[PDB]
Write an enzyme that holds these catalytic residues in place. Sequence first.
Site, PDB file in Angstrom:
ATOM      1  N   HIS A  41       4.932  10.203   1.397  1.00 25.34           N
ATOM      2  CA  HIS A  41       4.810   9.806   2.598  1.00 25.34           C
ATOM      3  C   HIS A  41       5.764   8.903   3.328  1.00 25.34           C
ATOM      4  CE1 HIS A  41       2.460   6.261   1.148  1.00 25.34           C
ATOM      5  NE2 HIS A  41       3.109   5.736   1.982  1.00 25.34           N
ATOM      6  N   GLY A 143       4.934  -2.552   3.102  1.00 24.41           N
ATOM      7  CA  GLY A 143       6.128  -2.592   2.152  1.00 24.41           C
ATOM      8  C   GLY A 143       5.977  -2.599   0.820  1.00 24.41           C
ATOM      9  N   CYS A 145       4.216  -0.228  -0.867  1.00 26.00           N
ATOM     10  CA  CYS A 145       4.073   1.048  -1.464  1.00 26.00           C
ATOM     11  C   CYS A 145       5.402   1.442  -2.308  1.00 26.00           C
ATOM     12  CB  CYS A 145       3.996   2.051  -0.167  1.00 26.00           C
ATOM     13  SG  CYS A 145       3.370   1.685   1.358  1.00 26.00           S
TER      14      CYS A 145
HETATM   15  C1  LIG Z   1       1.869   1.322   0.543  1.00 28.41           C
HETATM   16  C2  LIG Z   1       0.653   1.702   1.666  1.00 28.41           C
HETATM   17  N1  LIG Z   1       1.490   2.076   2.854  1.00 28.41           N
HETATM   18  P1  LIG Z   1       0.825   1.584   4.410  1.00 28.41           P
HETATM   19  O1  LIG Z   1       1.075   2.599   5.419  1.00 28.41           O
HETATM   20  N2  LIG Z   1       0.776   0.050   4.855  1.00 28.41           N
HETATM   21  C3  LIG Z   1       0.527  -1.056   3.975  1.00 28.41           C
HETATM   22  C4  LIG Z   1      -1.164  -1.055   4.123  1.00 28.41           C
HETATM   23 BR1  LIG Z   1      -1.597  -2.754   3.380  1.00 28.41          BR
HETATM   24  O2  LIG Z   1      -0.830   1.891   4.098  1.00 28.41           O
HETATM   25  C5  LIG Z   1      -1.735   2.844   4.654  1.00 28.41           C
HETATM   26  C6  LIG Z   1      -1.408   4.362   4.176  1.00 28.41           C
HETATM   27  C7  LIG Z   1      -0.054   4.752   3.854  1.00 28.41           C
HETATM   28  N3  LIG Z   1      -0.119   6.137   3.372  1.00 28.41           N
HETATM   29  C8  LIG Z   1      -1.357   6.208   3.465  1.00 28.41           C
HETATM   30  N4  LIG Z   1      -1.853   7.885   3.214  1.00 28.41           N
HETATM   31  O3  LIG Z   1      -1.061   8.458   2.229  1.00 28.41           O
HETATM   32  O4  LIG Z   1      -2.924   8.433   4.035  1.00 28.41           O
HETATM   33  N5  LIG Z   1      -1.991   5.400   4.121  1.00 28.41           N
HETATM   34  C9  LIG Z   1      -3.559   5.369   4.484  1.00 28.41           C
END
Ligand SMILES: *CCN[P@](=O)(NCCBr)OCc1cnc(N(O)O)n1C
Lengths: 305, 305
Positions: A41, A143, A145
């Site tokens: 993503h 960040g 992720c």
């Molecule tokens: C590492 C997660 N990324 P993020 O966009 N932002 C930090 C949240 Br504390 O989290 C939400 C996210 C990211 N990707 C998904 N997904 O694959 O649906 N989500 C829910």
Amino acid sequence: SGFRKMAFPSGKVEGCMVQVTCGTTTLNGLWLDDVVYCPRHVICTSEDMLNPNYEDLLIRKSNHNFLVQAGNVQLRVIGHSMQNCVLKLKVDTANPKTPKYKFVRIQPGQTFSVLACYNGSPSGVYQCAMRPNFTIKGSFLNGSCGSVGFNIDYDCVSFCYMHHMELPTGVHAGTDLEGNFYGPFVDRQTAQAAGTDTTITVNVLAWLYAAVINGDRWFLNRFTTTLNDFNLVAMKYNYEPLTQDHVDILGPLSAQTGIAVLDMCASLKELLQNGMNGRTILGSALLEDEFTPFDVVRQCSGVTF
Amino acid sequence: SGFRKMAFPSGKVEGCMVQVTCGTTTLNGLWLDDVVYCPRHVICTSEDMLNPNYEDLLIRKSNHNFLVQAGNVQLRVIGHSMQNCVLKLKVDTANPKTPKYKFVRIQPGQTFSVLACYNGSPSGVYQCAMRPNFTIKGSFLNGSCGSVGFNIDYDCVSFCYMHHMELPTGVHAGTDLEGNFYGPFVDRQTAQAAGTDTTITVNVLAWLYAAVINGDRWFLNRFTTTLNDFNLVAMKYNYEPLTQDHVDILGPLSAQTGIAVLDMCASLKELLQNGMNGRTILGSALLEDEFTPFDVVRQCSGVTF
Ligand SMILES: *CCN[P@](=O)(NCCBr)OCc1cnc(N(O)O)n1C
Ligand SMILES: *CCN[P@](=O)(NCCBr)OCc1cnc(N(O)O)n1C
Ligand SMILES: [Cl-]
């Protein structure tokens, strides 16, 4: 002596963390040999998250759209592909700090260390367990992720987790390093709720053995039980059923302490039915279930890497 | 989100750990520039521990009696001296992995990461606090002597602890990197008992702010208090008295959450007087006091190194 929630030394993995940027999104990737692994993503805008079609979104991306940075130096991307829910970015330089490593898919109840990173730079390390509902209870800010979870067997890092998202309840979901999510979760911003967070019974028992080895003995009683009778109590308190395989795996701890596995189950039974009456065990007022039997032996033996 | 007991990444310190042997005793040392630091009792036999005279025991030792091993390669010792309770072994090679570093003597209530080692090889990492009675609650088996505690500020490791011994009660005592013990403890096998393990009030409050930031809110009430009234309750429950300096240091957490420091003290007051009634806060059933206000801001902000 003393018993602590302990992570593996993180140096071997620190040397593998890089920063990946695609468009306006930056997260972490894992650089092993000449491949960088990261969540797919990274290619998404916040809009795309409601309902992303990853094959179509990938058509719009080329090697040069993936900006990979290792510390202060840029890596050249010479190929990219999608494997399940991760991207694999082929770079023209093999990571000189690549350790011996393996990709493993762990079972619920197993434990691992997480190296939380932001923008390719480490922030901290802590120990996690894969919950029976296939979430983990971590610490992941924006960040973070792409941070990974791992175990070390002597000199070989077994990578088992890559962080992808946080669910509305504040727990965390991710993939193995082949991009397959643990549990039923999907990389879309939508309604997915975690199931029952059952307690990992075998781990609680390992930790009770750890307490006995370290002087906390007050919870030992005069009772015993059977697998079938204990499991009636486990059911009531949302504990995983205990199997003969779990009993066998606790054998070494049973031998070191001289306390039969089923005797310790009887202690756990009373603790579940009566509570801790304001007491503590190894500095906790609840029953810890994120130590495996192997974790306990390891920490009570002094294994090194 | 999520909040976990987190240690600093250990790689920078892993590259400094060596093995030191003198006679039949092996423990760990810290190799920075061309000096290896280790506990002075490496020169002791188990007999000598009842009542050691370290100056006299040192007369019998020469450079070549101190066997220093860095991984698989031996270091050449070209000088040795005693500074308080540590030995400093001058070697002919500067550690090529020496990070930017400082030696700091920390105050009770401050936190730090420990890299537990055996025979110069890392085993695990965990987070500790210097207790008000100048012990720490660690995990140290035989051979773990010489493991160090540290903090990282961006790229500079501040070393604050070296492990020396375990007291009969199972808690741990050690020195700063100038060899001065924290608290009144001495490197002799004799009768020394730790004082009252008081709770670090300011840290408990930081952790309550952390819980609020992470969704655990049930303990917020409709009350407030004053420093002098709260401290009457702290006294009863063996909590450190809260000062204006502590209030000031909690300002940033007060601002982020909009909860006045004294309002949170009133919540802590009720928690001490009524207990948690079987509930949990950030996955704990007791009040955690080994997170500093700076730890919380750090982990809730995503600072990297
Ligand atoms: C590492 C997660 N990324 P993020 O966009 N932002 C930090 C949240 Br504390 O989290 C939400 C996210 C990211 N990707 C998904 N997904 O694959 O649906 N989500 C829910
Ligand atoms: C690292 C501690 N060394 P050790 O000899 N063995 C591991 C105990 Br789990 O601990 C006892 C010890 C070592 N030095 C002293 N001292 O300075 O009196 N003591 C008590
Ligand atoms: Cl607890």
